[PDB]
Coordinates of C-alpha atoms and ligand atoms in Angstrom, one line a residue:
Chain Y
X1 CA 0.0 0.0 0.0
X2 CA 1.8 3.1 -1.3
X3 CA 0.2 6.0 0.7
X4 CA 0.0 3.5 3.7
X5 CA 3.8 2.8 3.6
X6 CA 4.7 6.4 2.7
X7 CA 2.8 8.0 5.7
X8 CA 3.7 5.3 8.3
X9 CA 6.9 6.0 10.3
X10 CA 8.4 8.7 12.4
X11 CA 8.1 12.4 11.5
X12 CA 9.5 15.6 13.0
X13 CA 7.9 19.0 12.6
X14 CA 9.5 22.4 12.3
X15 CA 9.4 23.0 16.1
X16 CA 11.4 19.9 16.7
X17 CA 8.6 17.7 18.0
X18 CA 8.1 14.1 16.9
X19 CA 5.0 12.3 15.5
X20 CA 5.0 8.5 15.2
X21 CA 2.1 7.5 12.9
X22 CA 0.7 4.2 11.5
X23 CA -1.6 4.5 8.4
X24 CA -3.9 1.5 8.3
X25 CA -5.3 -0.3 5.3
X26 CA -8.8 1.0 6.1
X27 CA -7.9 4.7 6.0
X28 CA -7.2 5.0 9.8
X29 CA -4.3 7.0 11.3
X30 CA -3.1 6.2 14.9
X31 CA 0.1 7.1 16.7
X32 CA 1.6 9.4 19.3
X33 CA 2.9 13.0 19.4
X34 CA 6.2 13.1 21.5
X35 CA 7.9 16.3 22.7
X36 CA 11.4 17.1 21.4
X37 CA 13.2 14.3 23.4
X38 CA 10.6 11.5 23.9
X39 CA 9.8 11.1 27.7
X40 CA 6.6 9.5 28.9
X41 CA 4.8 12.5 30.3
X42 CA 5.3 14.4 27.1
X43 CA 3.5 11.8 24.9
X44 CA -0.1 12.0 23.7
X45 CA -2.3 9.8 21.5
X46 CA -3.2 10.9 18.0
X47 CA -5.9 9.6 15.8
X48 CA -7.1 10.6 12.4
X49 CA -7.8 9.5 8.8
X50 CA -6.2 9.6 5.4
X51 CA -7.3 9.0 1.7
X52 CA -6.2 5.4 1.4
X53 CA -6.7 5.5 -2.5
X54 CA -5.2 8.8 -3.4
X55 CA -5.2 10.4 -6.9
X56 CA -2.3 9.2 -9.1
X57 CA -1.8 12.5 -10.9
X58 CA 1.0 14.0 -8.9
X59 CA -1.3 15.4 -6.2
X60 CA -0.6 14.7 -2.5
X61 CA -2.6 12.4 -0.2
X62 CA -5.1 14.2 2.0
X63 CA -5.1 13.5 5.7
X64 CA -5.9 14.8 9.2
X65 CA -5.4 13.9 12.8
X66 CA -6.2 15.1 16.2
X67 CA -4.3 15.3 19.5
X68 CA -6.3 15.9 22.7
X69 CA -3.7 17.3 25.1
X70 CA -4.5 15.0 28.0
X71 CA -2.4 12.0 28.8
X72 CA -1.9 10.0 32.0
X73 CA -0.3 12.8 34.0
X74 CA -1.1 16.1 32.2
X75 CA -4.1 17.9 30.8
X76 CA -4.0 21.2 28.9
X77 CA -7.8 21.1 28.3
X78 CA -7.3 21.6 24.5
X79 CA -7.1 19.7 21.2
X80 CA -5.1 20.3 18.1
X81 CA -6.2 19.0 14.6
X82 CA -3.8 19.0 11.8
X83 CA -5.2 19.0 8.2
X84 CA -2.9 18.5 5.2
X85 CA -1.3 16.2 2.7
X86 CA 1.5 13.7 2.4
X87 CA 3.7 14.5 -0.6
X88 CA 6.0 11.5 -1.4
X89 CA 9.4 11.1 -3.0
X90 CA 13.0 10.8 -1.7
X91 CA 12.2 14.0 0.2
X92 CA 8.7 13.1 1.5
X93 CA 6.9 15.7 3.6
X94 CA 3.5 16.2 5.2
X95 CA 2.4 19.8 4.8
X96 CA -0.3 20.8 7.3
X97 CA -2.3 23.6 8.8
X98 CA -3.5 23.2 12.3
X99 CA -6.3 24.4 14.7
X100 CA -5.7 24.4 18.4
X101 CA -8.9 24.9 20.5
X102 CA -8.8 25.4 24.2
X103 CA -11.9 24.8 26.3
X104 CA -13.2 28.2 27.4
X105 CA -16.2 29.8 28.9
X106 CA -18.5 31.4 26.3
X107 CA -17.2 34.9 27.2
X108 CA -13.7 33.8 26.2
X109 CA -14.7 31.7 23.1
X110 CA -13.5 34.4 20.8
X111 CA -9.9 33.6 21.9
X112 CA -10.3 29.8 22.1
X113 CA -8.6 28.8 18.8
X114 CA -5.1 29.2 17.7
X115 CA -4.2 28.5 14.0
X116 CA -0.8 27.6 12.6
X117 CA 1.1 25.5 10.0
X118 CA 3.8 22.9 10.1
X119 CA 5.8 20.8 7.7
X120 CA 6.8 17.3 8.8
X121 CA 9.9 15.6 7.4
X122 CA 10.2 11.9 7.7
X123 CA 12.9 10.7 10.1
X124 CA 12.5 6.9 10.1
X125 CA 10.4 4.0 8.3
Chain W
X1 CA -19.0 10.0 31.7
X2 CA -20.2 13.6 31.9
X3 CA -18.3 14.8 28.7
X4 CA -18.6 11.2 27.4
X5 CA -22.4 11.2 27.6
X6 CA -22.7 14.9 26.5
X7 CA -20.8 14.4 23.2
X8 CA -22.1 11.0 22.3
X9 CA -25.2 11.0 20.1
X10 CA -26.5 12.5 16.8
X11 CA -25.7 16.2 15.9
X12 CA -26.8 18.5 13.1
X13 CA -24.7 21.3 11.6
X14 CA -25.8 24.6 10.2
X15 CA -25.7 23.1 6.6
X16 CA -28.1 20.4 7.7
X17 CA -25.7 17.5 7.6
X18 CA -25.7 14.9 10.4
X19 CA -22.8 13.8 12.6
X20 CA -23.2 10.6 14.7
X21 CA -20.5 10.4 17.3
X22 CA -19.5 8.0 20.2
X23 CA -17.1 9.4 22.8
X24 CA -15.2 6.6 24.5
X25 CA -14.0 6.3 28.0
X26 CA -10.4 6.6 26.9
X27 CA -10.8 9.9 25.0
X28 CA -11.6 8.5 21.5
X29 CA -14.2 9.8 19.2
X30 CA -15.6 7.5 16.5
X31 CA -18.6 7.9 14.2
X32 CA -20.1 8.6 10.8
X33 CA -20.7 11.9 9.0
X34 CA -23.9 11.8 6.7
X35 CA -25.8 14.1 4.4
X36 CA -29.3 15.2 5.5
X37 CA -31.1 11.9 4.8
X38 CA -28.6 9.1 5.6
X39 CA -28.1 7.3 2.2
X40 CA -25.2 4.8 2.1
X41 CA -23.1 6.6 -0.6
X42 CA -23.2 9.8 1.4
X43 CA -21.8 8.4 4.7
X44 CA -18.1 8.8 5.8
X45 CA -16.1 7.5 8.8
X46 CA -15.0 10.0 11.4
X47 CA -12.3 9.5 14.0
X48 CA -10.9 11.9 16.6
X49 CA -10.2 12.7 20.2
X50 CA -11.6 14.7 23.1
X51 CA -10.6 15.8 26.6
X52 CA -12.1 13.1 28.7
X53 CA -11.6 14.9 32.0
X54 CA -12.4 18.5 31.1
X55 CA -12.3 21.5 33.3
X56 CA -15.1 22.1 35.8
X57 CA -14.9 25.9 35.8
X58 CA -17.7 26.4 33.2
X59 CA -15.4 26.0 30.2
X60 CA -16.3 23.8 27.3
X61 CA -14.7 20.4 26.5
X62 CA -12.1 20.5 23.8
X63 CA -12.3 18.0 21.0
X64 CA -11.4 17.3 17.3
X65 CA -12.1 14.9 14.6
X66 CA -11.3 14.0 11.0
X67 CA -13.3 12.8 8.0
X68 CA -11.4 11.6 5.0
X69 CA -13.9 12.0 2.1
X70 CA -13.5 8.5 0.7
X71 CA -16.0 5.8 1.4
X72 CA -17.0 2.5 -0.4
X73 CA -18.0 4.4 -3.6
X74 CA -16.8 7.9 -3.6
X75 CA -13.5 9.6 -3.2
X76 CA -13.1 13.5 -3.2
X77 CA -9.3 13.2 -2.4
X78 CA -9.6 15.5 0.6
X79 CA -10.0 15.5 4.4
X80 CA -11.7 17.9 6.8
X81 CA -10.7 18.3 10.5
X82 CA -13.0 19.9 12.9
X83 CA -11.4 21.5 16.0
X84 CA -13.7 22.9 18.7
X85 CA -15.4 22.4 22.0
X86 CA -18.6 20.8 23.4
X87 CA -20.6 23.2 25.6
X88 CA -23.2 21.5 27.7
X89 CA -26.6 22.5 29.1
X90 CA -30.1 22.1 27.8
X91 CA -29.0 24.0 24.7
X92 CA -25.9 21.8 24.2
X93 CA -23.7 22.6 21.2
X94 CA -20.3 21.7 19.6
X95 CA -18.8 24.9 18.3
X96 CA -16.0 24.2 15.7
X97 CA -13.7 25.7 13.1
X98 CA -12.6 23.4 10.3
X99 CA -9.9 22.9 7.7
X100 CA -10.6 21.0 4.5
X101 CA -7.5 20.0 2.6
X102 CA -7.6 18.7 -0.9
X103 CA -4.7 16.7 -2.3
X104 CA -3.0 18.9 -4.9
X105 CA 0.2 19.2 -6.9
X106 CA 2.8 21.5 -5.3
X107 CA 1.9 24.3 -7.8
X108 CA -1.7 24.2 -6.6
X109 CA -0.9 23.8 -3.0
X110 CA -1.6 27.5 -2.2
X111 CA -5.3 26.7 -2.9
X112 CA -5.4 23.3 -1.2
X113 CA -7.2 24.3 2.1
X114 CA -10.6 25.7 2.8
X115 CA -11.4 27.1 6.2
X116 CA -14.8 27.4 7.9
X117 CA -16.8 27.1 11.0
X118 CA -19.9 25.2 12.1
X119 CA -22.1 24.9 15.2
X120 CA -23.6 21.6 15.9
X121 CA -27.0 21.1 17.7
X122 CA -27.8 17.8 19.4
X123 CA -30.8 16.0 18.0
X124 CA -30.7 12.6 19.7
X125 CA -28.7 10.7 22.5
Chain B
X1 CA -22.7 52.1 -6.1
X2 CA -24.8 49.2 -4.8
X3 CA -22.0 47.5 -2.9
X4 CA -20.6 50.9 -2.0
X5 CA -23.8 52.0 -0.4
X6 CA -24.5 48.6 1.0
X7 CA -21.2 48.3 2.9
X8 CA -21.1 51.9 4.1
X9 CA -22.6 52.3 7.6
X10 CA -22.4 51.1 11.1
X11 CA -22.3 47.4 11.8
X12 CA -22.4 45.4 14.9
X13 CA -20.8 41.9 15.4
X14 CA -21.8 38.8 17.4
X15 CA -19.8 40.0 20.5
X16 CA -21.6 43.3 20.7
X17 CA -18.8 45.4 19.1
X18 CA -19.2 48.2 16.6
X19 CA -17.6 48.6 13.1
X20 CA -18.1 51.9 11.3
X21 CA -17.0 51.7 7.7
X22 CA -16.9 53.8 4.6
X23 CA -16.6 52.1 1.2
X24 CA -15.1 54.4 -1.3
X25 CA -15.8 54.4 -5.1
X26 CA -12.3 53.1 -5.8
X27 CA -12.5 49.9 -3.6
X28 CA -11.0 51.4 -0.3
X29 CA -12.6 50.7 3.0
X30 CA -11.8 53.1 5.9
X31 CA -13.4 53.3 9.3
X32 CA -13.2 52.7 13.0
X33 CA -13.7 49.7 15.2
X34 CA -15.3 50.5 18.6
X35 CA -17.0 48.8 21.6
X36 CA -20.8 48.6 22.2
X37 CA -21.2 52.3 23.1
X38 CA -18.1 53.9 21.3
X39 CA -16.1 54.8 24.4
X40 CA -13.3 56.9 22.9
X41 CA -10.4 54.8 24.5
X42 CA -11.9 51.8 22.7
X43 CA -11.7 53.2 19.1
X44 CA -9.1 51.9 16.6
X45 CA -8.5 52.8 12.9
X46 CA -9.5 50.2 10.3
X47 CA -8.4 50.1 6.6
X48 CA -9.2 47.6 3.9
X49 CA -10.4 46.8 0.4
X50 CA -13.5 45.5 -1.3
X51 CA -14.5 44.3 -4.7
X52 CA -16.1 47.4 -6.2
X53 CA -17.7 45.7 -9.3
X54 CA -19.0 42.4 -7.8
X55 CA -21.0 39.7 -9.6
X56 CA -24.7 40.3 -9.9
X57 CA -25.7 36.6 -9.9
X58 CA -26.6 36.6 -6.2
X59 CA -23.0 36.1 -5.0
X60 CA -21.8 38.4 -2.2
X61 CA -19.1 41.1 -2.5
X62 CA -15.6 40.0 -1.3
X63 CA -13.9 42.3 1.2
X64 CA -11.2 42.4 3.9
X65 CA -9.9 44.8 6.5
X66 CA -7.2 45.3 9.2
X67 CA -7.2 46.8 12.6
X68 CA -3.9 47.2 14.4
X69 CA -4.7 47.3 18.1
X70 CA -2.9 50.4 18.9
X71 CA -4.6 53.8 19.4
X72 CA -3.9 57.0 21.4
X73 CA -3.9 55.3 24.8
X74 CA -3.6 51.5 24.4
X75 CA -1.4 49.1 22.5
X76 CA -2.1 45.3 22.6
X77 CA 0.9 44.6 20.1
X78 CA -1.5 42.8 17.8
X79 CA -3.5 43.2 14.6
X80 CA -6.7 41.4 13.4
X81 CA -7.6 41.0 9.7
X82 CA -11.0 40.1 8.7
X83 CA -11.8 38.5 5.4
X84 CA -15.3 37.9 4.1
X85 CA -18.2 39.0 2.0
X86 CA -21.1 41.4 2.1
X87 CA -24.5 40.0 1.3
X88 CA -27.2 42.5 0.7
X89 CA -31.0 42.4 1.3
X90 CA -33.3 44.1 3.9
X91 CA -31.2 42.6 6.8
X92 CA -27.7 43.0 5.3
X93 CA -24.8 41.0 6.6
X94 CA -21.0 40.8 6.3
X95 CA -19.9 37.2 7.0
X96 CA -16.3 37.0 8.0
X97 CA -13.4 34.8 9.2
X98 CA -10.6 36.6 11.1
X99 CA -7.0 36.2 12.0
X100 CA -5.5 37.9 15.1
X101 CA -1.7 37.9 15.2
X102 CA 0.2 39.1 18.3
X103 CA 3.9 40.2 18.1
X104 CA 5.9 37.4 19.6
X105 CA 9.3 36.1 20.2
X106 CA 10.4 33.4 17.7
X107 CA 10.0 30.8 20.4
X108 CA 6.4 31.7 21.0
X109 CA 5.6 32.3 17.3
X110 CA 3.7 29.1 17.2
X111 CA 1.0 30.6 19.4
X112 CA 1.0 34.1 17.8
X113 CA -2.3 33.7 15.9
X114 CA -5.9 33.3 16.8
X115 CA -8.6 32.4 14.3
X116 CA -12.3 33.0 14.5
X117 CA -15.4 34.1 12.7
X118 CA -18.0 36.9 13.0
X119 CA -21.2 37.9 11.3
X120 CA -21.9 41.7 11.3
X121 CA -25.4 43.0 11.1
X122 CA -26.0 46.5 9.8
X123 CA -27.4 49.0 12.3
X124 CA -27.3 52.3 10.5
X125 CA -26.0 53.9 7.2
Chain K
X1 CA 12.7 54.5 11.8
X2 CA 12.2 51.7 13.0
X3 CA 9.5 49.1 12.4
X4 CA 8.7 51.8 9.9
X5 CA 12.0 51.5 8.1
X6 CA 12.1 47.7 8.5
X7 CA 8.7 47.1 6.9
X8 CA 9.0 49.6 4.1
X9 CA 10.4 48.2 0.8
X10 CA 10.0 45.3 -1.6
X11 CA 9.4 41.8 -0.3
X12 CA 9.1 38.5 -2.1
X13 CA 7.0 35.5 -1.0
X14 CA 7.5 31.7 -1.1
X15 CA 5.5 31.5 -4.4
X16 CA 7.8 34.1 -6.1
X17 CA 5.2 37.0 -6.0
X18 CA 6.2 40.5 -5.0
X19 CA 4.8 43.0 -2.5
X20 CA 6.0 46.6 -2.4
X21 CA 4.9 48.2 0.9
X22 CA 5.3 51.6 2.6
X23 CA 4.8 51.8 6.3
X24 CA 3.6 55.2 7.5
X25 CA 4.5 56.9 10.7
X26 CA 0.8 56.7 11.8
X27 CA 0.5 52.8 11.5
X28 CA -0.8 52.7 7.9
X29 CA 0.5 50.3 5.3
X30 CA 0.0 51.1 1.5
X31 CA 1.4 49.4 -1.5
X32 CA 1.0 47.1 -4.4
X33 CA 0.9 43.2 -4.7
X34 CA 2.5 42.0 -8.1
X35 CA 3.9 39.0 -9.9
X36 CA 7.6 37.9 -10.3
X37 CA 8.6 40.6 -12.8
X38 CA 6.1 43.5 -12.2
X39 CA 3.8 43.0 -15.2
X40 CA 1.3 45.8 -15.0
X41 CA -1.8 43.6 -15.5
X42 CA -0.8 41.7 -12.4
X43 CA -0.6 44.7 -10.0
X44 CA -3.3 45.2 -7.2
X45 CA -3.6 47.8 -4.5
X46 CA -3.0 46.7 -0.9
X47 CA -3.9 48.6 2.3
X48 CA -3.4 47.7 5.9
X49 CA -2.1 48.5 9.3
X50 CA 0.8 47.8 11.6
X51 CA 1.8 48.3 15.3
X52 CA 3.8 51.5 15.0
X53 CA 5.3 51.3 18.6
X54 CA 6.0 47.6 18.9
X55 CA 7.7 45.8 21.9
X56 CA 11.5 46.0 22.1
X57 CA 11.9 42.8 24.0
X58 CA 12.7 40.8 20.8
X59 CA 9.0 40.3 19.8
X60 CA 8.0 40.9 16.2
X61 CA 5.9 43.7 15.0
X62 CA 2.2 42.8 14.3
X63 CA 0.7 43.8 11.0
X64 CA -2.0 43.0 8.5
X65 CA -3.2 44.0 5.0
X66 CA -5.8 43.3 2.4
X67 CA -5.7 43.0 -1.4
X68 CA -9.0 42.9 -3.2
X69 CA -8.4 41.0 -6.5
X70 CA -9.7 43.6 -8.8
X71 CA -7.6 46.1 -10.9
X72 CA -8.0 48.0 -14.1
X73 CA -8.3 44.9 -16.3
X74 CA -9.0 41.8 -14.1
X75 CA -11.5 41.0 -11.4
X76 CA -11.4 37.6 -9.5
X77 CA -14.3 38.7 -7.1
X78 CA -12.2 37.8 -4.1
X79 CA -10.0 39.4 -1.4
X80 CA -7.1 38.1 0.6
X81 CA -6.0 39.3 4.0
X82 CA -2.7 38.6 5.5
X83 CA -2.1 38.7 9.3
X84 CA 1.4 38.4 10.6
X85 CA 4.5 40.0 12.1
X86 CA 7.6 41.6 10.9
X87 CA 10.9 40.2 12.4
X88 CA 14.0 42.3 11.8
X89 CA 17.6 41.4 11.6
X90 CA 19.9 41.2 8.5
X91 CA 17.7 38.6 6.7
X92 CA 14.4 40.4 7.5
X93 CA 11.0 38.4 7.4
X94 CA 7.3 38.9 7.6
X95 CA 5.7 35.7 8.7
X96 CA 2.0 35.6 7.7
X97 CA -1.2 33.6 7.6
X98 CA -3.8 34.5 5.1
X99 CA -7.4 34.2 4.3
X100 CA -8.8 34.5 0.7
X101 CA -12.6 34.8 0.5
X102 CA -14.3 34.6 -2.8
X103 CA -17.8 36.1 -3.5
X104 CA -20.3 33.3 -3.4
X105 CA -24.0 32.5 -3.3
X106 CA -25.1 31.4 0.2
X107 CA -25.3 27.8 -1.0
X108 CA -21.5 27.9 -1.8
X109 CA -20.6 30.1 1.1
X110 CA -19.1 27.0 2.9
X111 CA -16.4 26.9 0.3
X112 CA -15.9 30.7 0.0
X113 CA -12.6 30.9 2.0
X114 CA -9.1 29.4 1.5
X115 CA -6.5 29.6 4.2
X116 CA -2.8 29.6 3.9
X117 CA 0.5 30.9 5.1
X118 CA 3.5 32.7 3.7
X119 CA 7.0 34.1 4.7
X120 CA 8.1 37.2 2.9
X121 CA 11.8 37.9 2.5
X122 CA 13.0 41.5 1.9
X123 CA 14.5 42.1 -1.5
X124 CA 15.1 45.9 -1.6
Ligands
LIG201 N1 4.5 20.9 17.6 C1 3.6 21.8 17.8 N2 3.3 22.4 19.0 C2 2.2 23.3 18.8 C3 1.8 23.2 17.3 C4 0.3 22.8 17.2 S1 0.1 21.8 18.6 C5 1.0 22.9 19.7 C6 1.4 22.4 21.1 C7 0.0 22.4 22.0 C8 0.3 21.8 23.4 C9 -0.9 21.9 24.3 C10 -1.2 23.3 24.8 O1 -0.2 24.1 25.1 N3 -2.5 23.7 24.9 C11 -3.0 24.9 25.5 C12 -2.7 26.1 24.5 C13 -3.4 27.4 25.0 C14 -2.5 28.6 24.7 C15 -3.3 29.9 25.3 C16 -3.5 30.9 24.1 O2 -2.6 31.7 23.8 O3 -4.7 30.9 23.6 N4 2.8 22.2 16.8
LIG202 N1 -21.1 19.8 6.6 C1 -20.1 20.5 6.0 N2 -19.9 20.3 4.7 C2 -18.6 21.1 4.4 C3 -18.2 21.7 5.7 C4 -16.7 21.2 6.1 S1 -16.7 19.6 5.4 C5 -17.5 20.1 3.9 C6 -18.0 19.0 2.9 C7 -16.8 18.5 2.2 C8 -17.2 17.3 1.2 C9 -16.0 16.8 0.5 C10 -15.5 17.7 -0.7 O1 -16.4 18.3 -1.3 N3 -14.2 17.7 -0.9 C11 -13.6 18.5 -2.0 C12 -13.8 20.0 -1.7 C13 -12.9 20.9 -2.6 C14 -13.7 21.9 -3.4 C15 -12.9 22.6 -4.5 C16 -13.3 24.0 -4.6 O2 -14.4 24.3 -5.3 O3 -12.6 24.9 -4.0 N4 -19.2 21.2 6.7
LIG203 N1 -15.0 42.0 18.2 C1 -14.0 41.1 18.3 N2 -13.1 41.1 19.3 C2 -12.2 40.0 19.0 C3 -12.6 39.3 17.7 C4 -11.5 39.4 16.6 S1 -10.7 40.9 17.1 C5 -10.7 40.5 18.9 C6 -10.4 41.7 19.8 C7 -8.9 41.8 19.9 C8 -8.5 43.0 20.9 C9 -7.0 43.1 20.9 C10 -6.3 42.0 21.7 O1 -6.8 41.6 22.8 N3 -5.1 41.6 21.3 C11 -4.3 40.5 21.9 C12 -5.1 39.2 22.2 C13 -4.1 38.0 22.5 C14 -4.7 36.9 23.3 C15 -3.6 35.9 23.6 C16 -4.2 34.4 23.7 O2 -4.9 34.1 24.6 O3 -3.8 33.6 22.7 N4 -13.8 40.1 17.3
LIG204 N1 1.1 35.0 -3.7 C1 0.0 34.3 -3.3 N2 -0.9 33.9 -4.1 C2 -2.0 33.2 -3.4 C3 -1.6 33.3 -1.9 C4 -2.7 34.1 -1.1 S1 -3.3 35.3 -2.3 C5 -3.4 34.0 -3.6 C6 -3.5 34.5 -5.0 C7 -5.0 34.8 -5.2 C8 -5.2 35.5 -6.6 C9 -6.7 35.8 -6.8 C10 -7.6 34.6 -7.0 O1 -7.2 33.6 -7.7 N3 -8.8 34.6 -6.4 C11 -9.8 33.5 -6.6 C12 -9.3 32.2 -5.9 C13 -10.2 31.1 -6.5 C14 -10.0 29.8 -5.8 C15 -11.1 28.8 -6.2 C16 -10.4 27.5 -6.7 O2 -10.0 27.4 -7.9 O3 -10.3 26.5 -5.9 N4 -0.3 34.1 -2.0

């Protein structure tokens, strides 16, 4: 599975953080976001989806995933979703834009959502 | 399961589409996005995450999910991620912003990502 | 001008705030963003552009503007841009999405930008 | 000076396009958005604002501007806004995110707006 094998592996973003992802044969993404070094308390579950039969015209493979920022010892009461595309080749990349929503009271809702972007480079199979 | 029972159920967005979601005990979100009526060809898998121990200060519960727009008969080579928060009460709602990325060649990548927002209203447990 | 006269006026957003705008014959937007009552210390300059010959097929009129949050007495070291479209009719609207960027250090650039949305309703011309 | 002097000039983005901007002493931004070479049919007016007394603690200078995609010969019935911040130094940058809304009917309004990002490098 071409998109499946291309997406699956370890990726690192522009901030230095690490994302380990497994693309399944049914379109599922599962893995873990790790901070810049890899210690337990800095790791969070990610789950998402990808187009498991992408176009064959040179376009990338659409995908997205979510991290809720709660693990077994921390909770930032917030969730980030990355939306983007895997672009293959010797120099494969996942180009994303992201939305980070914090839980807020309705009065503070206007400032609940950060937006950003990140490019991931593959580090390992 | 306060946030668990609040989120789980059937929801309707402002466009009229339906979102059936199950929030699990471990923070997973799993479900199906459908058009207005529920016809098989119009249904897509959704997977995401939410804060399963949210704050108790009146803030909403952060969450996110992804739909890759491929099912058993259609494929739009794109994925949308909703990022937002569930706000409880009798008038319960999920307020989100979303990112829809289409797979594209690198020359078209500047127009790969739509942004929007949607409020979901609960219609059934 | 139809879009010129439609956009020109006083508008109020979903948060209660006030947007006073003049749409010029050449596509310029100029005005002031204030609070619910127009307290002088709460007034900021806005500048923007609009499509001064928009479609007449029922589409709205594209437009955008910027407020830098600095005035005679306050400076939040930030700027919001709104992007959207004017839709005429008896109860006219401007539907927008907005980006708010704060000056940050490189290390905090990742959280420099909030995203949201607002619908403005016309109150006076 | 100083965010004034840093911002003012010619910038080029990641796609190769050009923006010429003047930052005014009152917080105004004015200029033109063009293509790679400055073909007249490809020029559009931009207007915006910036923080004209930014922090000095190393933070960038917040700014934003709009281009409506209509000039003397073309109209794409759309407008982009960039929101970002100017960071000085020898290799000066403006890091932005942007929103491009097209005029739509209400039925197409859900797909009216593209989002993206761009880093501008000063060229002149
Ligand atoms: N590697 C990355 N790190 C950042 C981006 C998108 S995900 C983000 C890290 C998010 C960690 C959880 C967190 O800090 N959540 C609370 C953020 C609220 C910030 C308050 C605000 O300025 O609105 N990519
Ligand atoms: N209920 C909702 N429907 C819309 C919003 C965010 S998800 C979206 C439906 C997306 C369906 C899949 C789809 O049409 N994918 C391709 C979209 C690219 C459109 C190209 C263009 O005209 O710019 N919420
Ligand atoms: N009427 C509106 N008010 C809000 C929205 C978009 S414009 C915004 C008001 C912005 C006022 C200036 C301001 O507070 N700037 C700095 C805010 C940074 C918050 C930092 C964070 O929590 O991420 N619409
Ligand atoms: N240098 C840049 N070029 C792109 C980004 C943000 S501004 C954008 C250029 C936009 C030119 C005007 C334009 O094409 N407007 C209509 C966009 C139609 C998108 C619909 C589609 O084909 O999917 N930066």
